[PDB]
Design an enzyme around this catalytic site. Structure first.
Site, mmCIF file in Angstrom:
data_model
loop_
_atom_site.group_PDB
_atom_site.id
_atom_site.type_symbol
_atom_site.label_atom_id
_atom_site.label_comp_id
_atom_site.label_asym_id
_atom_site.label_seq_id
_atom_site.Cartn_x
_atom_site.Cartn_y
_atom_site.Cartn_z
ATOM 1 N N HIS A 20 68.599 19.603 21.285
ATOM 2 C CA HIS A 20 68.191 20.383 20.378
ATOM 3 C C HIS A 20 66.979 21.290 20.497
ATOM 4 O O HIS A 20 65.996 21.012 19.872
ATOM 5 C CB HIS A 20 68.124 19.827 19.054
ATOM 6 C CG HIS A 20 69.449 19.491 18.430
ATOM 7 N ND1 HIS A 20 70.100 18.010 18.320
ATOM 8 C CD2 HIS A 20 70.293 20.121 17.888
ATOM 9 C CE1 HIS A 20 71.399 18.252 17.789
ATOM 10 N NE2 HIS A 20 71.438 19.267 17.428
ATOM 11 N N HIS B 44 69.977 25.224 23.176
ATOM 12 C CA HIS B 44 70.841 25.115 22.427
ATOM 13 C C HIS B 44 71.309 26.317 21.337
ATOM 14 O O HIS B 44 72.680 26.782 21.334
ATOM 15 C CB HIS B 44 70.807 23.705 21.814
ATOM 16 C CG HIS B 44 71.710 23.639 20.438
ATOM 17 N ND1 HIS B 44 73.082 23.355 20.745
ATOM 18 C CD2 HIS B 44 71.687 23.648 19.326
ATOM 19 C CE1 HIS B 44 73.810 23.319 19.578
ATOM 20 N NE2 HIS B 44 72.373 23.229 18.576
HETATM 21 MG MG LIG Z 1 72.175 20.988 13.140
HETATM 22 ZN ZN LIG Z 2 73.264 22.524 16.027
#
Ligand SMILES: [Mg+2]
Ligand SMILES: [Zn+2]
Ligand SMILES: Nc1nc(Cl)nc2c1ncn2Cc1cc(OCC(F)F)cc(OC(F)F)c1
Length: 338
Positions: free
Chosen positions: A75, A79
């Protein structure tokens, strides 16, 4: 405008599904969202629609990309650059082009950019159990999802230099804001099957019913009328952002495996922290000392992906994505070797 050659070569075939997102990450030095954002926003003509300048867009993509944590394995900004790329691809398809309006395309591309801004590499349930500032702030309900959208607008509008919505009309921005918020909040894990069921029941099944007649001119305009409604466009927006977010199992084999490691490393790190701090173990299967990643990806694909992308594919027609989903699933199966 004056993009350097590595980063320029890295963004050659950005229209295509096969796209080396990690070469762009390596080229940009963990700044893929600003470079890939500028091309895509220009290609769609987003500041032309919003009436912002190119300089306001650069500042906007900078401050959001800054708030993406580089330390997060999965994350991070790369991403979101991947999710942005999948979103644009879906918008570029004919079905989505001839259903959604220009305001939805802008909402989709903006939603994809911001949807995980300031992600702490940790799930909602971890924050609720831990008693985190944001879990207390959002009352253990859509904690991350609300924080992303809220912060994303705090950063945008709160400063004049970043405000890409400054030159909009209040009526248009009010629609666009509501559309982005909905698309960002639709990515929550707990609402998965609600948004899949809603899509199939109201789009796929009725579209399949209308194909009883075939391709009649009166029937085609009825098929146009039903899908293009305000409610049914929101459902396609929820389905597109949900598919784009978790599109990594439908990628080329190398990128699937790279994305598989990153998200897995992130869940092991949470699990190691959860036992350290004396928290209840929310995702016990994802421990570095017991988790089979090939088996775990098969289960993930079985539970979430296979039904969702099947429903999505029938609507949009995605032969390349589903062929990768077959190849990647077969690869994970082949790694047992016992
Ligand atoms: Mg999310
Ligand atoms: Zn996501
Ligand atoms: N390849 C991958 N494998 C695993 Cl395990 N999770 C992945 C992943 N790619 C993205 N994730 C995030 C994710 C997405 C997800 O669906 C989001 C939707 F429901 F909003 C559910 C998840 O829970 C559980 F599967 F861990 C995790």
């Amino acid at each position: 405008d004056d993009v350097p050659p590595r980063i320029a070569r890295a963004m050659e075939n950005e229209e295509y599904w096969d796209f080396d997102i990690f070469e762009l990450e390596a080229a940009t030095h963990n700044r893929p969202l600003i470079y890939l954002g500028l091309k895509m926003f220009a290609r769609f003509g987003i500041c032309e629609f919003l009436h912002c300048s190119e300089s306001t867009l650069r500042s906007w993509l900078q401050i959001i990309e800054a708030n993406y944590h580089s330390s997060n394995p999965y994350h991070n900004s790369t991403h979101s650059a991947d999710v942005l790329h999948a979103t644009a691809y879906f918008l570029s398809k004919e079905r989505i082009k001839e259903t959604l309006d220009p305001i939805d395309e802008v909402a989709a591309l903006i939603a994809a950019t911001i949807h995980d801004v300031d992600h702490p590499g940790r799930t909602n349930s971890f924050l609720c159990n831990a008693g985190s500032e944001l879990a207390i702030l959002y009352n253990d309900t859509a904690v991350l999802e609300s924080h992303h959208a809220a912060l994303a607008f705090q950063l945008t509008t709160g400063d004049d230099k970043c405000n890409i919505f400054k030159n909009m009309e209040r009526n248009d921005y009010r629609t666009l804001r509501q559309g982005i918020i909905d698309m960002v909040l639709a990515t929550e894990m707990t609402k998965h099957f609600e948004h899949v069921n809603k899509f199939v029941n109201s789009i796929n099944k009725p579209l399949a019913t209308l194909e009883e007649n075939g391709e009649t001119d009166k029937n085609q305009e009825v098929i146009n009328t039903m899908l293009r409604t305000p409610e049914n466009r929101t459902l396609i927006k929820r389905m597109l952002i949900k598919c784009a977010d978790v599109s990594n199992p439908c990628r080329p084999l190398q990128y699937c495996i790279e994305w598989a490691a990153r998200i897995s490393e992130e869940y092991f790190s949470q699990t190691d922290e959860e036992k350290q701090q004396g928290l209840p173990v929310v995702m016990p299967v994802f421990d570095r000392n017991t988790c089979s990643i090939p088996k775990s990806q098969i289960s993930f694909i079985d539970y979430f992906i296979t039904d969702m992308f099947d429903a999505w594919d029938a609507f949009v027609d995605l032969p390349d994505l589903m062929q990768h989903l077959d190849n990647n699933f077969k690869y994970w199966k082949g790694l047992d070797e016992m």
